[PDB]
Design a protein around this ligand. Structure first.
Ligand code: NFU
Ligand code: SF4
Ligand code: F3S
Ligand SMILES: [Cl-]
Ligand SMILES: [Cl-]
Ligand SMILES: [Cl-]
Ligand SMILES: [Mg+2]
Lengths: 599, 270
């Protein structure tokens, strides 16, 4: 029925709306909401609709093989699970990897961040902000003028170029076979962009689709292939030789990588960040500041990208936890502490001995229990309306010291901003990006477009669907900049005479302690990722993953506290409750990865 | 008219959809806009919920027996099929519905083809490959985790140009892409033939690109185009970047022992 939690007044008496499948995500999700007399969402229900059981499958296998299994949790955030796995095994066995392996892993991680973020925004998210049919009405000359205002440095800006792109779209649509645009919500009043902005965005959608395949060639060089590049416990397999054409890594290969990094930097600076700033400005002007959810109070990240390896104080995206919207106090987060990260299954399709408690992942349990509540409409194999008072999702409910947290690029940027305000110098660049962005959104872009200047603070702008989308773009840019530096450090280290790529001292399990436990954490594209392993007599005894979309998409916990997705949808008006435009726009701002969330 | 493709997703990691968009020849953009009509695909489609599901019925009616069903991932038989739920119903019911009127069925990747990672022991969801569920339709398997991008678009291109499934081997794989073992043309073969092997990671042999057989390379028993076509516009492949093949295009590769355990009987592969 109705109850209050975390400042939200949940009420399920209104009209029930079902969105199944939620499309333009990775994997499978069902979303249900209730709307009031004025089409405002007053209840939201997040249902993960898939499970594979990787945690169960890993039992008894060799820890050195684990990375390849868990990599297949997700082909979108491809490699982040492999990284978490090798880190967890290295932690369990006290293995320190050499400098070149560290830098190569960081470059692969930051390449994934950029590819994942840019593809998400253009190919999954943009159609929630952009009306492709409106782009057909655009004047190519005014689109060229907009492009030159939005991003002066982007060379692809002529009226003729935009006309050609428009004409291809026109012919595609006029064929009667609309493909990915079929049955879309085009013409909804939820869309506010002018035709020229729509054409600009669709043009960049097509540019990004062609360019994204180039960026991943960095993974291919270091890891053999993309998706699913290879990793290694103890280092990297891509051995180095300069003097050499039959080594995985030589100077020509490194020069190739640098050429790709430079292309990435240009795309982020000239295409991606400016588009998000421009679209964000126009939706801000429309007053669409919904979707803040838990970002306004509680955010978490483990912290990542130490500029000195194994020295967490040097994290370039410094982490921790913020509670109650107090940005003056960042709490330290310890993934080894049994009282911090815990998972509940009270409203999930699993079972524990006692479901009134949350388990730390070293003590985690994954036993499936697909059962539906008494208030379900439909049957076990034909659900009409899911019963959120009972078990309603394949996603577990992770909490931090019992608190529900939002994770992701937005969480990392709020944390970075908080750290920077307390004197942390490693967070200077994200702070600079945020201040630059607020000035662009409030003053510069409005002035260029003849719109009124606004005075929103970062504390006001960031906790919103617009802010969540912005943070992703800024993070992409920051990651591109960081791996540019990593490349220089890698080459410098190799030229100084250190060619080491793997520590094999503890490769053989005859060298291992007879039991051990370890944890590996990663700032994955969607937020805080952790793998927790227990090893016994050379084998995996327990392996538990808590993944970013597990946090964000989580169902309610034992106390009935809602997770980030459900909180973000609350109190959002819908133009038409039968067209899920606003639901998709906000859910997509989290970049939901459902295969990840359930594993 | 461009041939409709209804691209379904079961239990999956989405690696096959991702690999598909890496294609350089042809570009995925050109495939979507000019070659096929990608009418259903949960990863890219504008419509959601009821609007998305309504597309299936429309296309199946208007193009009966003249659309391609592409399947990424697979259906689970445990949990009453509800370890993969679409539109409140088991995925298997969607798969069977769309398969009935398809001209051809493509099983993308190792999941759809053979079971994939979720089917590795003890297979908690009883994940089952497409050809064990759909037993009365022509199916082409395009295995690999994921398959090479140009192999995926190569299969589509052939099917669209000729309105035919290409010649298949006994396991249902296209001979034009899966006739060779990795080991047949692997550029490290001269080292294998001379008994020159990597024995520990980053040893002197590894820096010289010696054969990876003794580090567990499953290239000698794995059929794919990786050693010739290679990955991401011919940039590299697992072995060129220094890791042995783990056998990812082969049936049950997840349960063939540790990836780092060498194959026995080395003289078989000489
Ligand atoms: N980013 C990301 Fe994955 Ni497909 C999620 N959620 C995870 O680690
Ligand atoms: S065993 Fe592997 S690395 Fe060696 S020649 Fe064969 S395929 Fe190549
Ligand atoms: S692991 Fe797979 S990608 Fe090719 S080299 Fe082996 S078949
Ligand atoms: Cl986005
Ligand atoms: Cl039930
Ligand atoms: Cl398999
Ligand atoms: Mg888990």
């Amino acid at each position: 029925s109705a109850y209050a939690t975390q400042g939200f007044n949940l009420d399920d008496r209104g009209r029930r709306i079902v969105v199944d499948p939620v499309t333009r995500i990775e994997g499978h999700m069902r979303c249900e909401v209730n709307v009031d007399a004025n089409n405002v969402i007053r209840n939201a229900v997040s249902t993960g609709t898939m499970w594979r059981g990787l945690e169960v499958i890993l039992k008894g296998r060799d820890p050195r093989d684990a990375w390849a299994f868990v990599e297949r949790i997700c082909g979108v955030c491809t490699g982040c699970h492999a990284l978490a796995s090798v880190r967890a095994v290295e932690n369990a066995l006290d293995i320190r990897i050499p400098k070149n392996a560290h830098l190569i892993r960081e470059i692969m991680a930051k390449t994934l961040q950029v590819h994942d973020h840019a593809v998400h925004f253009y190919h999954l998210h943009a159609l929630d902000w952009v009306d492709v049919m409106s782009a057909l009405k655009a004047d190519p000359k005014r689109t060229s003028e907009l492009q030159q205002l939005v991003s002066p440095a982007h060379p692809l800006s002529s009226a003729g170029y935009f006309r050609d792109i428009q004409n291809r779209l026109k012919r595609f649509v006029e064929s009667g076979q609309l493909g990915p645009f079929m049955n879309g919500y085009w013409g909804s009043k939820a869309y506010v962009l002018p035709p020229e902005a729509n054409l600009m965005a669709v043009t960049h959608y097509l540019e990004a689709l062609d360019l994204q395949k180039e960026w991943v060639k960095i993974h291919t060089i270091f890891g053999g292939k993309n998706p699913h590049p290879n990793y290694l416990v103890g280092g990297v397999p891509c051995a180095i030789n300069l003097d050499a054409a039959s080594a995985p890594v030589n100077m020509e290969r490194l020069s190739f990588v640098k050429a790709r990094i430079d292309e990435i930097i240009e795309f982020n600076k000239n295409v991606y960040v400016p588009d998000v700033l421009a679209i964000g400005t126009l939706y801000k002007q429309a007053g669409w500041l919904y979707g803040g959810g838990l970002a306004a109070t509680n955010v978490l990240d483990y912290g990542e990208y130490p500029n000195v390896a194994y020295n967490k104080s040097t994290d370039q995206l410094p982490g921790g936890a913020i509670l109650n919207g107090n940005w003056d106090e960042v709490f330290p987060v310890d993934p080894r502490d049994s009282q911090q990260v815990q998972e509940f299954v009270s409203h999930s399709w699993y079972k524990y001995a006692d479901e009134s408690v949350g388990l730390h992942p070293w003590d985690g349990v994954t036993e499936p229990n697909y059962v539906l509540g008494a208030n379900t409409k439909g049957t076990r194999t034909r659900i009409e309306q899911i019963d959120e008072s009972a078990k309603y999702s394949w996603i577990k409910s992770p909490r931090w010291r019992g608190h529900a947290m939002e994770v992701g690029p937005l969480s990392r940027y709020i944390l970075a901003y908080a750290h920077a305000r307390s004197g942390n110098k490693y967070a200077e660049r994200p702070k600079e990006q945020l201040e630059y962005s607020a000035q662009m959104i409030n003053s510069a872009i409005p002035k260029a477009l003849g719109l009124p200047e606004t005075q929103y603070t970062l504390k006001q702008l960031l906790p919103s669907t617009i802010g969540r989308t912005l943070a992703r773009a800024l993070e992409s840019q920051y990651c591109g900049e960081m791996m540019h530096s990593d490349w220089h450090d890698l080459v410098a280290n190799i030229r100084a005479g250190d060619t080491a790529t793997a520590n094999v001292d503890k490769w053989d399990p005859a060298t291992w302690p007879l039991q051990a436990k370890g944890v590996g954490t990663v700032a994955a594209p969607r937020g805080a990722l952790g793998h927790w392993i227990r090893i016994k007599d050379g084998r995996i005894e327990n392996y538990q993953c808590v993944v970013p979309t597990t946090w964000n998409g989580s169902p309610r916990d034992y106390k009935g506290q809602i997770g980030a997705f459900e909180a973000s949808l609350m109190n959002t008006p819908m133009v038409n409750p039968e067209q899920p435009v606003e639901i998709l726009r906000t859910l997509h701002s989290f970049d939901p990865c459902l295969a990840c969330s359930t594993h | 008219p461009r041939t409709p493709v209804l691209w379904l997703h079961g239990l999956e990691c989405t690696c096959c959809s991702e690999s598909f968009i890496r294609s350089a020849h042809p570009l995925a953009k050109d495939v979507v806009l000019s070659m096929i009509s990608l009418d259903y695909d949960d990863t890219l489609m504008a419509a959601a919920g009821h609007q998305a599901e309504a597309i299936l019925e429309e296309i199946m009616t208007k193009y009966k027996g003249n659309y391609i069903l592409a399947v990424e991932g697979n259906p689970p038989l445990n949990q009453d099929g509800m370890s993969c739920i679409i539109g409140g119903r088991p995925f298997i019911e969607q798969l069977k519905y769309v398969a009935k009127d398809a001209k051809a069925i493509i099983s993308w990747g190792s999941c759809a083809s053979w079971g994939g990672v979720q089917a590795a022991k003890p297979n908690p969801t009883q994940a089952t490959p497409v050809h064990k569920v759909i037993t009365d339709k022509p199916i082409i398997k395009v295995p690999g985790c994921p398959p090479i991008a140009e192999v995926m678009t190569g299969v589509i291109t052939y099917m669209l140009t000729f309105d035919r499934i290409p010649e298949l081997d006994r396991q249902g794989r296209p001979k034009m892409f899966y006739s060779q073992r990795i080991h047949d043309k692997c550029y490290r073969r001269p080292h294998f033939d001379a008994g020159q092997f990597v024995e520990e990671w980053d040893d002197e042999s590894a820096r010289k690109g010696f054969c990876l057989y003794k580090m567990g390379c499953k290239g000698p028993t794995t059929y794919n185009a990786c050693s010739t076509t290679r990955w991401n516009e011919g940039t590299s492949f697992p072995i060129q970047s220094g890791h042995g093949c783990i056998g990812c295009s082969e049936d049950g590769f997840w349960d063939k022992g540790s990836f780092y355990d060498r194959l026995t009987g080395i003289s078989q592969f000489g």
